[PDB]
Every structure is written in C-alpha cells, then in structure tokens.
Amino acid sequence: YNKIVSHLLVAEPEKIYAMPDPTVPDSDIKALTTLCDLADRELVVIIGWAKHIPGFSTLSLADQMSLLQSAWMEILILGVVYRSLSFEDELVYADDYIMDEDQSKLAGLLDLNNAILQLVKKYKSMKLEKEEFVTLKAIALANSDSMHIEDVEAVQKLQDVLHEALQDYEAGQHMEDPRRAGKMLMTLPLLRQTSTKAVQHFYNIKLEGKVPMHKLFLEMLEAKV
Amino acid sequence: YNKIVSHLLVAEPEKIYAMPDPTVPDSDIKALTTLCDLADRELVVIIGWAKHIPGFSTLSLADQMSLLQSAWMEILILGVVYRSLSFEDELVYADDYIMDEDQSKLAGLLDLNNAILQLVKKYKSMKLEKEEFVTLKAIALANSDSMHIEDVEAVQKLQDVLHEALQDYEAGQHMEDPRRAGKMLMTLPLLRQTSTKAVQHFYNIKLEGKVPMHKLFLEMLEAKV
Ligand SMILES: CC(C)(c1ccc(O)cc1)c1ccc(O)cc1
Ligand SMILES: CC(C)(c1ccc(O)cc1)c1ccc(O)cc1
C-alpha cells in the first residue's frame, strides 16, 4: 500500500516497562508515581519518533517543539488505547502494568480511565488496524493546534501529506467503506477531550506536591496548562 | 447540490438579541449575566432546530436528550464563530453584543475568547461557507460522544448520513481540493477542546454564585460537568 504508512510502521518504537517498585506498598501515590515515571521515559521516545515523520525535522526547532508540547498527551493516550484493544475493561500502560477498575479507583483515575476505555471501545468496534493507528498518531501530532506556530504553511503541508496517506490507505484497503477515513478522523475529538481533561488532572497533582515528577514530564505539563 | 445541506440551510434559526440591560453599569457580572442569559434562550432554539435533522426525531427521547446534553456548548460556540468570520478580533455573540479584547479582559474571558478566535481564524483561512457551517453543526451534534446512548447503531447511522452529505457537498463544490471534507472534520478537535474548557469555566462561575443563571442553562451545565 501507501509508503508513508509503511515508513511509520518501521519507525514505531519498542515497548518500555513500567517497573513498579516491588518493595513499596500499593497506594494511590505508588500508582501515580509509576505512571508519571513511565510517561517521562515515553516522552523521550516520542521525541525520537517524531524525527521520522516526513517533513517534521525540516520545521524549525521552535515549531517542532511547539507541536510536541501540544500533542504529547494525545500521543501517550493513543498508545495505551492501542495496547488495550484486545483486553476487556483493562488498560495496558505496559506489559508489567495493566490497570483494572479497582486500581483506577485506588489511584483516583476512575473517570479519566473510563474516558480512555470509551476510546478503546470505539476503536474495537471499528477494528482499528496498526496501519491506521500509526497514521492517526502522526496526524494527532500535526493537527495539535498549537497557538505558537511560526511557519503555518509548512505545518498545514505536514497535515496534508499525512491526511493524504490515510485517505490513500483507506481507499486501497477498505473499498467496502468509502467513508472509513472520515470515520477515523471523527474519533479525534474524543482523544482531544480526554487529553485536555488528563492535562488538568495531572496538573492538580503537580500542585499538590505529594507525587514526585521528573523534569521532562513537568516541563511538558507546564507548556500545556 | 446535496439535499441534506439545503434542508439544513432552510432549518437554520433566526438570530436573537442579547439585550444587555442599559440601566446597569458595565462590569464582569453584567457581561456574564448577559452571555448566560443569551445562551439560555439559544438553547431553546437549538432544541427546536435539532428536530429538523433527518433521523434525529426518530431516536428515543433519551438518546435525543443525551446528544443535546453533550453537544450544546459546541453548537453555541460554532454559532459565535460563524457570526464572527467577517470581523477582526471581535466576537459577535449577537448583533447588539460584540466583544473585543478589552471586554473579554473585563469579563475574565480573555483566554476562552482567544481560543474561540483561534477557531475563527482557522475557518477564515479555509473560507468556511454557510453550507459547510450548518453541516458541521449537525455533525457536532451527532458525533458528541455521549456515554449514555442506548441505540448506538441509530446514532452511528445518523453520523454516517451527515458525513455523507459533507462528502457529497465537497465533491461537487470543491473539486479543486479533494481533501476539503477531511480538513473540515479535522477542525472538530479544536472545537471540542474549547467547549470542554468553556464548560469548566462556567461551572466554576456557577459555584461562585454571584452570576444569576436560568434553569435550562444550569440543567445543561450540570449534565456536562
Ligand atoms: C499521562 C499518563 C500518566 C500516561 C502515562 C503513560 C502512558 O502510556 C499514557 C498516559 C496518564 C494519563 C491519563 C490517565 O488516565 C492515566 C495515565
Ligand atoms: C456559553 C457562552 C456563555 C455562550 C453564550 C452565547 C453563545 O452564542 C455562545 C456561547 C460562552 C462560552 C464561552 C465564552 O468564551 C463566552 C461565552
């Protein structure tokens, strides 16, 4: 099929581990510390991954940073959604960190994790493919609506190149549904909504000061609130 | 062109007036009272308008209510965006109520109104047509991601019928841009984001108790928070 899609597939990063501390008693603080720690390390991987998107590394460093600062939370959440597709009512943050309803309750994440499960259920019913996943991830990056973009034309071109890839892929692989590309795009508002709420939630947790957070995650949280 | 589009055009409601109280001194409280009062009356008009969308009135009353309860804020904001297209840095809430930067500052709405202006600027550059406007409004209603839907198949069919109309319209009227429909759909995440933030803001203002709010607006605010 489409070359941008196959390129995005080979650029897809390796899974990383949560490694929750086995000497520490389970609590809300432990789960949150674990999750924030995992996200901090994934952000490093996401920065590396973005460099493989055609056109991205030719934007100015400022525009690259602006896109990443706007989109990072949506990209993280899309990841856990995709990892969770073949599970039921469980969220696979990592192979060694799967949250069910009870742990979500414990961590104070029930409402947020329930919103993420709503995303999972929608992609389950549409039978989201890996090809579609990696392309939406790139589109979420490019369509992240940063207020601080310099070369808007270049960013729009980036959006168009990725949108075309999605369109091309869907035309060749899903002839039975000529509106599948548009259906995929219409899942983006729920991703943006959930991401907006997630940024607010973890910012409150930053302010409360009981959960340790690393520099990158904090920096990224700061730029979005 | 497409019949659903022409039908949505004739179903488009009359503009209503803000009628700010001319005996009351300008303040944050006056602006907010005016805006909330305007929204309350527009919600009545939006309920009436929805009945004209093909398929909508055949959903159960519960599913109709669920869609409206999820989508109402996006529909209000899309309205002010459309009214503001031919203005510069001004938001036309009504013909007798146009907010500039200073009044937004006064009302404590600078950040929220700046997000709405970001929407305006994006549709200006794409040259949003009235045909496209009324169709996106209907799509925002149908794609509102309520958690409490009963007949999901019927709602998805509603989404598909409206998405097809957009697709049909764009194919016939904008042959020069075969991705225009998808570009329109990719504006929806910014609308959802702004609407999510707006619901949080006015809910805080509800809690503070200094701004009088009518029953419908309060009821709708309650169902979304
Ligand atoms: C940002 C967050 C810590 C996270 C961590 C890791 C991850 O892969 C995806 C998301 C997160 C967000 C929302 C949420 O409900 C749980 C965890
Ligand atoms: C909901 C609100 C009072 C409104 C009132 C009327 C309207 O047409 C659109 C929006 C509103 C939301 C966000 C905002 O920044 C100003 C006013």
Query: What is the CATH classification number for the domain harbouring B14?
Result: 1.10.565.10
At residue B186, the 3 state secondary structure works out as coil
- Per the document, the length of chain B is 225
Write the DSSP assignment of B35-53 as a string of letters: HHHHHHHHHHHHHHHHTTS
Contacts of B164 in chain A (CB under 8 A): 179
In degrees to the nearest 10, what's the CA dihedral of B186, B189, B190, B196? 160
Q: Is A35 in the pocket of ligand 1 (CB under 6 A)?
A: yes
CB within 8 A of A32, min separation 6: which ones?
A: A107, A108, A205, A211
CA–CA min distance A8, chain B (Å): 20
Contacts of B145 in chain A (CB under 8 A): 118, 189-190, 193
A192 and B197 within 8 Å at the Cβ level: the answer is no
CA of B202 from ligand 2 middle (Å) equals: 9
> Measuring CA to CA, how many Å separate A42 from each of A145, A164, A205?
22, 28, 19
CA distance A202 to A198: 6
At position A12, the amino acid (one-letter code) is E
Alpha carbon A99 to its chain's center: 17
At residue A166, the 3 state secondary structure works out as helix
Alpha carbon B177 to its chain's center: 26
Is residue B12 within 8 Å of B134, Cβ to Cβ? Answer: yes
Q: In which domain, by residue range, is A224 found?
A: 1-225
Query: Are β-strands A97-99 and B91-94 bridged in parallel, bridged antiparallel, or unpaired?
Result: unpaired
In B11-146, alpha helices (H) = 28-50, 61-83, 101-107, 110-126, 130-142
CA distance A137 to A8: 10
How many domains does chain A contain in total? 1
**Chain B window 133-192: which residues touch A at a Cβ cutoff of 8 Å?**
139, 143, 145, 147, 159-160, 163-164, 166-167, 179, 181-183, 185-186, 188-192
The closest alpha carbon to B158, from B69, B64, B62, B46, belongs to B64
User: Phi and psi for A93 in degrees, rounded to 5?
Assistant: -65, -35
Is residue A164 within 8 Å of B182, Cβ to Cβ? Answer: no
A206 touches chain B (CB under 8 A): no
Q: Is A134 in the pocket of ligand 1 (CB under 6 A)?
A: no
